[PDB]
Amino acid sequence: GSHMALSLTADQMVSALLDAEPPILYSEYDPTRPEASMMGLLTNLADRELVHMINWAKRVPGFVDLTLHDQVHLLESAWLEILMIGLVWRSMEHPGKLLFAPNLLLDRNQGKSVEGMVEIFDMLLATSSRFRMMNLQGEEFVCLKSIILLNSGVYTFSLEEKDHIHRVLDKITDTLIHLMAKAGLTLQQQHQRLAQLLLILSHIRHMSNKGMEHLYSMVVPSYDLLLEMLDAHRLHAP
């Protein structure tokens, strides 16, 4: 059968998002050589991550209810924020370092290698440390990542279709609140924590904007490339 997004319980939402999670990818460099472009390695990894991101987005409840056109718009707006939140998530347990891959752990000083890269590393590190200080949970993380996908390009857009995106966002909010209530936080505590997490999302937006400026100054997937990737997914084996 098929669940409609708006009928999911909190536990079914959590379960669907956990099940949709992409794998952790490794960097493609020979462990026999030192002698590699940092830019090259990060570009190669991001590219492989994007393929998995397409498969993931298709599994975010509500996403496939939208038109192909609207799906591509959302991904085009959100793809860097999504790569960034995943990065800061897995870097939480590594104070002062970014875990790009289990075989690609980088500090501040290594970031200085590429020009304009150091401001962005620092902002990512601050996000990772804020998430560690808040003890961000995996269940919360998957909800935040889905919120990024559905909200990033909603205002830069068929009005009844917008209510649907807004109703799916309300469902994800409900799911976050339910996780926090089960964790034993009080009402005010539930609200304060929700606020804190949503406010971090504006910082993630900021980082993505700065990231995009930096990428465009030199790689960036266009509406057309994302459309092509979303469409090609239909030809993948089950």
Ligand SMILES: Cc1c(OCCNCCCF)ccc(F)c1[C@@H]1c2[nH]c3ccccc3c2C[C@@H](C)N1CC(F)(F)CO
């Ligand atoms: C994302 C990106 C890039 O993306 C190119 C897009 N690929 C094209 C799509 C069609 F194939 C090209 C070089 C990079 F160094 C990075 C990196 C980068 N790589 C990652 C890999 C996994 C997880 C997170 C990241 C980040 C965040 C972050 C530090 N990124 C730096 C910046 F923010 F993009 C610079 O402004």
